[PDB]
Design an enzyme around this catalytic site. Structure first.
Site, PDB file in Angstrom:
ATOM      1  N   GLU A 111       1.225 -19.301  59.996  1.00 19.49           N
ATOM      2  CA  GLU A 111      -0.114 -18.747  60.086  1.00 19.49           C
ATOM      3  C   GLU A 111      -0.080 -17.246  60.101  1.00 19.49           C
ATOM      4  OE1 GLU A 111      -2.915 -20.082  59.684  1.00 19.49           O
ATOM      5  OE2 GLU A 111      -2.612 -22.237  60.004  1.00 19.49           O
TER       6      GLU A 111
ATOM      7  N   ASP B  85     -10.105 -15.140  60.489  1.00 17.95           N
ATOM      8  CA  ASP B  85      -9.086 -15.780  61.318  1.00 17.95           C
ATOM      9  C   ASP B  85      -8.294 -14.691  62.006  1.00 17.95           C
ATOM     10  OD1 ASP B  85      -9.848 -18.204  60.156  1.00 17.95           O
ATOM     11  OD2 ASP B  85      -8.109 -18.333  58.883  1.00 17.95           O
TER      12      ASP B  85
ATOM     13  N   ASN C 234     -10.308 -19.111  63.979  1.00 13.31           N
ATOM     14  CA  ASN C 234     -11.453 -18.786  63.153  1.00 13.31           C
ATOM     15  C   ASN C 234     -12.688 -18.468  63.957  1.00 13.31           C
ATOM     16  OD1 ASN C 234     -13.405 -18.862  61.017  1.00 13.31           O
ATOM     17  ND2 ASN C 234     -12.564 -20.660  60.057  1.00 13.31           N
TER      18      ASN C 234
ATOM     19  N   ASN D 293     -12.131 -15.142  55.475  1.00 13.08           N
ATOM     20  CA  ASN D 293     -12.461 -16.386  54.781  1.00 13.08           C
ATOM     21  C   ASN D 293     -13.626 -16.145  53.827  1.00 13.08           C
ATOM     22  OD1 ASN D 293     -10.491 -17.784  56.386  1.00 13.08           O
ATOM     23  ND2 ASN D 293     -11.983 -17.828  58.055  1.00 13.08           N
TER      24      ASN D 293
ATOM     25  N   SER E 157     -16.372 -15.603  57.679  1.00 13.36           N
ATOM     26  CA  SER E 157     -15.683 -15.696  58.971  1.00 13.36           C
ATOM     27  C   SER E 157     -14.291 -15.063  58.805  1.00 13.36           C
ATOM     28  CB  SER E 157     -15.558 -17.156  59.386  1.00 13.36           C
ATOM     29  OG  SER E 157     -14.729 -17.932  58.523  1.00 13.36           O
TER      30      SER E 157
ATOM     31  N   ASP F 140     -16.395 -17.676  53.442  1.00  9.03           N
ATOM     32  CA  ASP F 140     -17.713 -17.757  54.062  1.00  9.03           C
ATOM     33  C   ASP F 140     -18.068 -16.543  54.932  1.00  9.03           C
ATOM     34  OD1 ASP F 140     -16.195 -18.190  56.369  1.00  9.03           O
ATOM     35  OD2 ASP F 140     -17.027 -20.173  56.815  1.00  9.03           O
TER      36      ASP F 140
END
Ligand code: CL
Ligand code: CL
Ligand code: CL
Ligand code: CL
Ligand code: NA
Length: 129
Positions: free
Chosen positions: A35, A52, A59, A46, A50, A48
């Protein structure tokens, strides 16, 4: 902070992640590797809108507040910046809530695609645990 592998394993163990919801410590170290490459400052935007955050790429769509993900939740009741700290406590406490949601560690796409089913204990081999 970029953690060393055993340094991260020991901190995760101390904070009770080892065998949390039945996931051995190697699963968590492997998830963090893929990750964030063990970097607490990792971030990724992301599609959309958002973001992380942190060692486990948590998220903002559901789990933390960054003030720039309209209509999102903050289920860990924390600012997303807390997930970037050198101290992993906030990331660990939030990951415990995430893994308790119905899909377990499949919530971490990198765990499902790169850790799940592999020899995850190799991620803690050599560490004094
Ligand atoms: Cl393990
Ligand atoms: Cl927001
Ligand atoms: Cl820590
Ligand atoms: Cl599970
Ligand atoms: Na949020």
């Amino acid at each position: 902070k970029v953690f060393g592998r055993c340094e991260l394993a020991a901190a995760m163990k101390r904070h009770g992640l080892d065998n949390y919801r039945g996931y051995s410590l190697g699963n968590w170290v492997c998830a963090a590797k893929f990750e964030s490459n063990f970097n607490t400052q990792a971030t990724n935007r992301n599609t959309d809108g958002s973001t992380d955050y942190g060692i486990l790429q948590i998220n903002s769509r559901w789990w933390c507040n960054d003030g720039r993900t309209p209509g999102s939740r903050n289920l860990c009741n924390i600012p997303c910046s807390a997930l970037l700290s050198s101290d992993i406590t906030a990331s660990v406490n939030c990951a415990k809530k995430i893994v308790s949601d119905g899909n377990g560690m499949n919530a971490w796409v990198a765990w499902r695609n790169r850790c799940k089913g592999t020899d995850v204990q190799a991620w803690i081999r050599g560490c004094r645990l």
